[PDB]
Design a protein around this ligand. Structure first.
Ligand SMILES: *[C@@H]1O[C@H](CO)[C@@H](O)[C@H](O)[C@H]1NC(C)=O
Lengths: 26, 49
């Protein structure tokens, strides 16, 4: 649940899943 | 990859993005001019100008 130092983005695995789960000339 | 006999193409809101020179055959694209709002950061006008 805490940030993962190894990843370049200082996030947590749950935060990583949250970022990945939810996601051009105008 | 345009059909050779065809002439040009467009996109949303009539944002046409293709031309062709009648004398020389080539394909080209456009991109509208860079633009934007200009903001100003200032402290209190009495403090400084
Ligand atoms: C700005 O400074 C002047 C003094 O030169 C003062 O009269 C005025 O109330 C000040 N304005 C603000 C918004 O503090």
């Amino acid at each position: 649940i805490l940030p993962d130092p190894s990843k370049p983005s200082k996030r947590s695995p749950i935060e990583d899943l949250l970022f990945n789960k939810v996601t051009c000339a105008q | 990859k345009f059909l050779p006999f065809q002439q040009f193409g467009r996109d949303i809101a009539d944002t046409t993005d293709a031309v062709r020179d009648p004398q020389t055959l080539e394909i080209l694209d456009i991109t509208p001019c860079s633009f934007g709002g200009v903001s100003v950061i200032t402290p209190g006008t009495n403090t400084s100008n």
